Amino acid sequence: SFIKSLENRRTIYALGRNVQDEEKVIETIKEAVRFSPTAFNSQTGRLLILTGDAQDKLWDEIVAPELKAAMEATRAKLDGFKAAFGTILFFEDQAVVKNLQEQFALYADNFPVWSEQGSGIISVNVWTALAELGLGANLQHYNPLIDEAVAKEWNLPESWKLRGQLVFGSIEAPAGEKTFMDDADRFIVAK
Amino acid sequence: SFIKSLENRRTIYALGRNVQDEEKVIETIKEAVRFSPTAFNSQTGRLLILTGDAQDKLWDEIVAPELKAAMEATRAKLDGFKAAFGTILFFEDQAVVKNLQEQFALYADNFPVWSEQGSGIISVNVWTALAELGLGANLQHYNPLIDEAVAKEWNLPESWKLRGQLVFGSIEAPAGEKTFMDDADRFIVAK
Ligand SMILES: Cc1cc2nc3c(=O)[nH]c(=O)nc-3n(C[C@H](O)[C@H](O)[C@H](O)COP(=O)(O)O)c2cc1C
Ligand SMILES: Cc1cc2nc3c(=O)[nH]c(=O)nc-3n(C[C@H](O)[C@H](O)[C@H](O)COP(=O)(O)O)c2cc1C
Ligand SMILES: O=C(O)c1cccnc1
Ligand SMILES: O=C(O)c1cccnc1
């Protein structure tokens, strides 16, 4: 069921490269995003999908140095990210947001918020789709630190605002324990 | 598959009250939220689930008047919402957000954003879960207009910030046509 699928999605930090079908994975990622809803069907999400050489480059040449060259003013956490099969960088196209604000100024204040919600939406739908394939993932946030260098290396338009980075790969160790709130404190039903 | 489930979720405006098992529906809604990820497992989402009398009250006594008593300074759109089986109001608990900002001030700026993303996440997971049950839904945003009156009528804590309202019920007419972007304009793959 769909509920079971949601349940199978978890944060997996121990990731490897035991991935059997790269293309199938890529297609699944696109689909998860394609069939995700967005305000006005604006489809503001953008993805950079890195595997192999680019995966190593992101973490060894970009994240790590900018992290270390910042602390001044890490591993083997970074080693754990690099060791994964790939990283999916989620952006939101600010250009579309601005246009929407102009075309429909009645909702100018909303589009930014709906865009943010849209990033959460596609991020978890990809995350869950990958879990269904038996692949694990975890979501990182080294934005805005690495924004500039990522755009430069992969020639991304300036309008792509980085929101998060979903590291993914083969599951090499199970998710940890997780707790839940009391239902009574977050659900109210009235008839 | 999970992809199929995502695909089955659509915006349905023609809704009715041909719902067979209210309790099963309620349980499904809770589960969709329960198994949704949130930053720091903060679980900031809160739901008010209205059916029957409360459903009618929301749209007839709250939304409509405040909408009309605002325009001065509608139907049968509102009639279409009221005609549905219920409305799920999604809130984000600002109290938890603030505490997080204090406990982890290193991420003070993030929690607000992660909270917003969290609302999108649980909203679409509920939306999709309902679709799997054969029920349709559409997402409305009469916040912040109706915030105050909703809190008053159902004695909600002030800390619950309303984010959206998902009207749901039996599908009485199919979704309209929808277009998609060119893949080339929103997906970049590098290896
Ligand atoms: C964050 C968000 C906000 C939305 N706001 C509204 C709204 O206020 N009123 C409405 O009727 N639909 C709203 N929509 C529905 C979208 O227009 C719809 O999901 C999109 O056009 C794709 O169509 P689909 O839901 O049938 O897949 C919203 C969707 C999202 C994800
Ligand atoms: C919007 C959002 C932001 C998150 N930020 C991070 C992060 O920066 N680093 C990290 O390791 N996990 C992050 N998480 C993972 C959550 O802590 C995790 O989903 C939550 O504890 C529930 O655990 P689960 O993913 O195994 O279900 C984030 C999750 C969400 C939904
Ligand atoms: O198309 C939408 O998503 C929409 C419709 C009405 C109001 N706000 C957004
Ligand atoms: O637990 C989280 O979600 C988390 C972990 C590290 C950094 N930011 C968030």
CA angle A94, A97, A98 (to 5 degrees): 90
CB contact under 8 A, B117 and A117: yes
Under 8 Å CB-to-CB from A73, ≥6 apart: which residues? none
As annotated, the binding site of A for FMN includes 9-11, 13, 40, 140-141, 178
Partner residue facing A54 (CB), from B2, B128, B191: B191
Instruction: Confirm if A44 and A90 have CB atoms less than 8 A apart.
Output: no
- With CA atoms as reference, the chain B residue closest to A107 would be B141
Q: State how far Cα A57 lies from the chain centre.
A: 18
Which runs of consecutive H residues, i.e. helices, occur in chain A? 2-8, 22-34, 52-57, 64-71, 77-82, 94-103, 110-132, 147-153
Give the Cα-Cα-Cα angle A25, B6, B191 (nearest 5 degrees). Answer: 20
Helix, strand, coil content of chain A in percent (nearest 5): 50, 20, 30
- Pocket lining for ligand 3, CB < 6 angstroms: A 39-40, 107
Q: Is A173 exposed, middle or buried (0-12, 13-18, 19+ CB in 10 A)?
A: exposed
Give this entry's resolution in angstroms: 2.1
A81-99: b (≥16 Cβ within 10 Å) or e: bbbbbbbbbbbbbbebbee
Phi, psi dihedrals of residue A2, rounded to the nearest 5°: -65, -40
User: Any long-range contacts for A144-150 (C-beta under 8 Å, 24+ apart)?
Assistant: A145/A66, A145/A67, A145/A70, A146/A62, A146/A63, A146/A66, A149/A62, A149/A66, A150/A48, A150/A58, A150/A62, A150/A89
Distances (CA, A) of A31 to A53, A127, A158: 24, 12, 25
Range of the domain at B67: 1-191
CB of A11 sitting under 6 A from ligand 2:
yes
C-beta atoms of B47 and A187 within 8 A: yes
- B13 φ, ψ (degrees, to nearest 5): -90, -30
- Report CA-CA distances (Å) from B101 to A54, B105, B122, B144: 34, 5, 22, 23
Q: What residue type is A135 in one-letter code?
A: L
Give the residue, out of A36, A40, A110, A113, with the most ligand 3 atoms within 8 A of its beta carbon, to mutate for a pocket test: A40
Dist. CA A122–CA A37, nearest whole Å: 8
Q: Report CA torsion sign: B115, B124, A116, B48.
A: negative
Residues of chain A with Cβ-Cβ distance to B2 below 8 Å are 2, 5, 32, 128-129, 132
The alpha carbon of residue B129 is apart from the nearest alpha carbon of chain A, in Å, by 6
Cα B18 to Cα B14, B15, B21, B54, B132, distances in angstroms: 12, 9, 10, 17, 15
Q: How many domains does chain B have?
A: 1
Chain position carrying tokens 């309902």? B130
Count of other CB atoms within 10 angstroms of residue B110: 17
Question: What type of residue sits at position A177?
Answer: E
Instruction: Give the number of C-alpha atoms closer than 13 A to the C-alpha of residue B137, restricted to the C-beta side.
Output: 30
**Checking phi first, is residue B187 left (phi over 0); if not, alpha (psi -120 to 50) or beta?**
beta
Amino acid at B20: Q
What is the rounded CA–CA span in Å between residue B190 and residue A53?
Answer: 8
* Measured distance CA(A73)–CA(A66) in Å, rounded: 11
Encode B123-144 in three state secondary structure: HHHHHHHHHHCCEEEEEECCCC
Gap between the terminal Cα atoms of chain B: 27
The CATH number of residue A43's host domain is 3.40.109.10
Residue in A with minimal Cα distance to B140: A39
- By CB atoms closer than 10 A (0-12, 13-18, 19+), residue B6 is buried
| CA-closest candidate to residue A186, choices B29, B81, B52, B15 | B29
> Using alpha carbons only, what angle is made at residue B140 by residues A103 and A30, rounded to the nearest 5 degrees?
70
The count of other CB atoms within 10 Å of the CB of residue A51 is 22
Which of B77, B141, B178, when mutated, tests ligand 3's pocket best, judged by the most ligand atoms within 8 Å of its CB?
B141
For the CA of B77, the nearest ligand: 1
Triad B64, B68, B72: Cα angle to 5°: 170
Q: How far apart are CA A39 and CA A78, in angstroms?
A: 35
Q: A36 near A122, Cβ under 8 Å?
A: yes
Please state, in angstroms and rounded to a whole number, the distance separating the CA atoms of residues B122 and B42: 13
